[PDB]
Amino acid sequence: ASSPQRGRPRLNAARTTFVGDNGQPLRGPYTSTEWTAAAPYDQIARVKELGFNAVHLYAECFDPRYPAPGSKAPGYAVNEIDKIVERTRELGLYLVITIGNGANNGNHNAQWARDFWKFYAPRYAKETHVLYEIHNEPVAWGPPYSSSTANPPGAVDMEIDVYRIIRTYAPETPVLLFSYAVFGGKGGAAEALKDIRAFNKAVFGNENAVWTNEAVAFHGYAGWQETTIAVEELLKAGYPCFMTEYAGGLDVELTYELERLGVSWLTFQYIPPTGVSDDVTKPEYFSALVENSGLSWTPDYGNWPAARGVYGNGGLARETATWINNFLTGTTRIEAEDFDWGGNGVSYYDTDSVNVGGQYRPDEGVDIEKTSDTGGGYNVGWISEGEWLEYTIRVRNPGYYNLSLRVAGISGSRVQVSFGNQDKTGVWELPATGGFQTWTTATRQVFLGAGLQKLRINALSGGFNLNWIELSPI
Ligand SMILES: O[C@@H]1[C@@H](O)[C@H](O)OC[C@H]1O
Ligand SMILES: O[C@@H]1[C@@H](O)[C@H](O)OC[C@H]1O
Numbered sequence: 312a313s314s315p316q317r318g319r320p321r322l323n324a325a326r327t328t329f330v331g332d333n334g335q336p337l338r339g340p341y342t343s344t345e346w347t348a349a350a351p352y353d354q355i356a357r358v359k360e361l362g363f364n365a366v367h368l369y370a371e372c373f374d375p376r377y378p379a380p381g382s383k384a385p386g387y388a389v390n391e392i393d394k395i396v397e398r399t400r401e402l403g404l405y406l407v408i409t410i411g412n413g414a415n416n417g418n419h420n421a422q423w424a425r426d427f428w429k430f431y432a433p434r435y436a437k438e439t440h441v442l443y444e445i446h447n448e449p450v451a452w453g454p455p456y457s458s459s460t461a462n463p464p465g466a467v468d469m470e471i472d473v474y475r476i477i478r479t480y481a482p483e484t485p486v487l488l489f490s491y492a493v494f495g496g497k498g499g500a501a502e503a504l505k506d507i508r509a510f511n512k513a514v515f516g517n518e519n520a521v522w523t524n525e526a527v528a529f530h531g532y533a534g535w536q537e538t539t540i541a542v543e544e545l546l547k548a549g550y551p552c553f554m555t556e557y558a559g560g561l562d563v564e565l566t567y568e569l570e571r572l573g574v575s576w577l578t579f580q581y582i583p584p585t586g587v588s589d590d591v592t593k594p595e596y597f598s599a600l601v602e603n604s605g606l607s608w609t610p611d612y613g614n615w616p617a618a619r620g621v622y623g624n625g626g627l628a629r630e631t632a633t634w635i636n637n638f639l640t641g642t643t644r645i646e647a648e649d650f651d652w653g654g655n656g657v658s659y660y661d662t663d664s665v666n667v668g669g670q671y672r673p674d675e676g677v678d679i680e681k682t683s684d685t686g687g688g689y690n691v692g693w694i695s696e697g698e699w700l701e702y703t704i705r706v707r708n709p710g711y712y713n714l715s716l717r718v719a720g721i722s723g724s725r726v727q728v729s730f731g732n733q734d735k736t737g738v739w740e741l742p743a744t745g746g747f748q749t750w751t752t753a754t755r756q757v758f759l760g761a762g763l764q765k766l767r768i769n770a771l772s773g774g775f776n777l778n779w780i781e782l783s784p785i
């Protein structure tokens with residue numbers, strides 16, 4: 312159609328999340344109209360250059376005293392919400408609208424929430440780019456809301472009543488339920504399933520309803536490890552989900568897991584000029600974290616993050632091994648020839664576009680030949696000054712590691728190795744071995760932070776070949 316406006320997001324084929332009108336997950340930062348003007352058009356537009364296609368809107372903040380004299384009724388920010396709706400429409404962005412809480416996270420006012428959606432549900436029902444998230448963090452702090460001892464009680468009744476209101480006026484609009492603050496472990500999933508069953512019985516007539524246009528909203532405050540478990544278990548039970556608020560700046564580890572699982576996400580960094588957390592346009596809170604980690608997805612707009620991935624290892628970041636007693640739990644060896652794919656100037660830099668060795672990856676630029684070193688396979692050769700190679704890894708535990716390079720060189724050479732774009736080695740002199748297939752292992756101790764990060768080999772000179780890289784904890 313003659314409109315940049317995005318079409319209805321729908322549940323994906325795998326029923327893991329809502330995806331857009333191109334089959335891609337929704338990814339975005341947040342803004343608020345709770346006590347501020349609409350973020351400016353030109354600031355909202357910046358999200359597109361950061362690989363995003365969606366915006367999370369905390370539209371109005373509930374009044375806990377409503378409807379007493381002096382309380383603020385819903386609908387007060389309509390003129391600002393309308394601007395967000397229009398600006399996202401024209402920019403080709405999705406918009407997730409919710410009720411915020413101000414000082415009262417982990418709480419809600421049911422009447423206020425029903426009246427908010429009676430007004431807003433019909434108002435934006437026909438905006439195909441707009442989704443409705445019933446209520447931010449309505450209970451302190453997670454499932455089961457259906458417990459008689461939930462703090463406060465009755466949130467599932469609010470979810471039910473609001474869902475009916477929404478569907479009465481907005482029959483096609485995606486609805487995100489619950490917005491659990493802390494959603495962690497097998498236990499978190501099991502408790503959420505109690506709430507889901509109770510909701511389903513009341514709304515659909517059957518505890519085990521198959522949702523066609525609904526998902527569970529959840530937040531990341533259980534931490535990345537526990538949240539990943541809960542998401543995995545819920546997805547196994549057959550209920551899609553959607554991350555609506557989390558932070559570490561960007562929580563790189565949780566983003567990696569949500570990408571793997573096929574779950575849409577809204578990060579808790581704000582569109583300038585203002586918000587209660589950190590600005591998404593400052594590199595230190597988002598783009599630098601993405602860049603240094605090697606995280607990538609296909610953006611709806613622009614070419615950032617760049618298309619890239621792990622070569623081999625089933626496309627998963629190469630996790631570092633640990634010790635149990637005197638043995639290693641898994642491989643420590645990263646083959647030099649298994650550099651990230653992505654291309655020249657993205658995942659490697661090579662001075663000639665052809666692989667002059669012709670082997671292994673003939674259609675990429677890195678020069679690769681068969682090796683006569685122990686164990687066979689291949690080595691990177693024709694290494695020249697200024698070339699570099701990146702490998703996306705995941706450091707399981709922070710601390711000291713032995714970093715080993717299996718190298719050969721007729722004469723002397725120099726390398727330097729960065730991790731997450733931080734130099735960990737300085738200049739590392741590799742003395743001559745006397746031949747390009749006369750192999751030695753060079754080792755240096757490095758101190759690494761935990762997490763997803765790119766290991767980058769920088770050739771400070773030519774004159775050496777590289778078979779493989781090993782990393783093991785001290
Ligand atoms: O009011 C909102 C609050 O509920 C959430 O914790 O952070 C975003 C705020 O604007
Ligand atoms: O790296 C080596 C290259 O420089 C040499 O000239 O051809 C053989 C390779 O091992």
Ligand SMILES: [Ca+2]
Nearest residue numbers: 661663665676
């Ligand atoms: Ca080349």
Ligand SMILES: [Ca+2]
Nearest residue numbers: 661678693694
């Ligand atoms: Ca080369």
Ligand SMILES: [Ca+2]
Nearest residue numbers: 646647689778
């Ligand atoms: Ca090799």
